[PDB]
C-alpha cells in the first residue's frame, strides 16, 4: 500500500539510528552466526533470526509493505536477543538499549507515515 521508497526515505533514520550506537549495536549488524559461536542450539530457541543487516536489506530490497512491518522485525530482533540470552550478557544489556533509542526514533515517524 506503500511504494518502497517512502518507506525507505522515512524508516531508514530510525535503523540508522540504531547503528549509531557503540558498543550496543556491534552483536546485532550481522546475523547470529551458531558455527562460529559454538551455539548449536541457537536455532532451536530462535526459529526466526532477525539481525539490523537483514532489516537494512529488506528496505533497500522493497519486501515491506507497510510500516509495522518493519516495526515487527525490529521487535523480533529484539525479543530473540532477550530470550536466547541471559539478562548478565552484554547482548541482552545491549538489547535493551537498541530498545530504548527504537522506541524514541519510531515514535514520530509511525504518526508521519499514518
Ligand atoms: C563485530 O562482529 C562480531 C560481533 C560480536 C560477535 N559475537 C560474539 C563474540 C563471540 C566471541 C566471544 C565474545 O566475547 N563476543 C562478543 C560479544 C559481545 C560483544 C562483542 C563480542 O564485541 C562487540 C560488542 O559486544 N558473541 C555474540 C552473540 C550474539 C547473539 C545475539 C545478538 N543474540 O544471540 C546471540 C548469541 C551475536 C554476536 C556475537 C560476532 C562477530
Redesign the pocket.
Same mark, same amino acid.
Given at each position: 500500500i506503500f511504494k518502497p521508497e517512502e518507506l525507505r526515505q522515512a524508516l531508514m533514520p530510525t535503523l540508522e539510528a540504531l547503528y549509531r550506537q557503540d +558498543?550496543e549495536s *556491534?552483536?546485532?549488524?550481522?546475523p547470529?552466526? +551458531?558455527q562460529? *559461536?559454538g551455539?548449536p542450539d541457537?536455532f532451536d530457541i530462535?526459529k526466526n533470526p532477525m539481525?539490523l543487516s537483514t532489516i537494512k536489506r529488506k528496505l533497500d530490497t522493497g519486501q515491506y509493505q507497510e510500516p509495522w512491518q518493519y516495526v515487527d522485525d525490529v521487535w523480533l530482533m529484539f525479543n530473540?536477543?532477550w530470550l536466547?540470552?541471559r539478562k548478565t550478557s552484554?547482548?541482552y544489556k545491549?538489547?535493551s538499549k537498541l530498545a530504548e533509542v527504537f522506541e524514541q526514533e519510531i515514535d514520530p515517524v509511525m504518526q508521519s507515515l499514518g
Open positions: +558498543p *556491534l552483536p546485532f549488524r550481522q547470529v552466526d +551458531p562460529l *559461536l551455539i541457537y530462535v539481525d530473540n536477543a536466547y540470552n552484554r547482548v545491549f538489547c
